[PDB]
C-alpha cells in the first residue's frame, strides 16, 4: 500500500 518504511 503505502511505500514508505512503516
Amino acid at each position: 500500500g503505502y511505500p514508505g518504511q512503516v
Partner: antibody
Amino acid sequence: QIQLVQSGPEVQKPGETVRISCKASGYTFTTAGMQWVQKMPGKSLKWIGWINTRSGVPKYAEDFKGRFAFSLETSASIAYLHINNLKNEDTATYFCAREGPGFVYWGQGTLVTVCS
Amino acid sequence: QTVVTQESALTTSPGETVTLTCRSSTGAVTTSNYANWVQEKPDHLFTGLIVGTNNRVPGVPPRFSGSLIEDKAALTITGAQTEDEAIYFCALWYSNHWVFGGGTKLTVLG
C-alpha cells in the same frame, strides 16, 4: 518516551551549506523511516522527502532534490539533512518526523536563517 | 498541481464537537491517500494525531478521530478542550509525494 531532538538554529549567508541533525530515542532507529519537512515563515508545510533507515534509500520531493540531501549515522540514531548552496528562500524551520504512514512523531524544529 | 484545502479557521467552545475537513483538488480523498492530521502549538511544536485516515497516534486522547466524509478526510474532536486551541494540518499521499493542506486555526472559547 519516543523523542526526536534536532540541532539548534543556524544562521548562514547565501551560497553556504548547513547540516541539521535529528537524534532519535525510544524506539529501534532502523525500523521506521525518517521524513523531513520545511515550514517557511508564516506559510504551510512542504514535504522534503524520507530516508529508509533500514536500507539507507531516500525518496525526495522534486523541488528539493537538487540541493537537499539526507544521510544517516545509524550507530548514533541520527538522521541528517544537508542543504547546500543556500538561497534566501531556504529560510524556514525544518522538521524531522518519523513514519508512519506519514508523520507520527515530530522533532522540535530547526530554524535556518539565510541572511539576505 | 494537486492542492489540499482545509478551512482557514474555526471556533468552538468547551465540550462541543467540531469537524475539520481536508479536500483534494484531484477528486475524492480515499484510503490510498493515507490522510494525516497533525497539530501545531507555539512555538512550532508539532505532534501527530492521526495517520492512515483513522489511526490515532499512541498517546493522543480518544476525543480525536479521523475518517472520510463525503469525499474529504475529516478530523472530529468530540468534546473540545481549551488545550485543543492550535493549528491543525492535514497531509495526503499522492502515489509518490506528500502534500500538506494550509492548516486550520482552531479557536477554543473559554
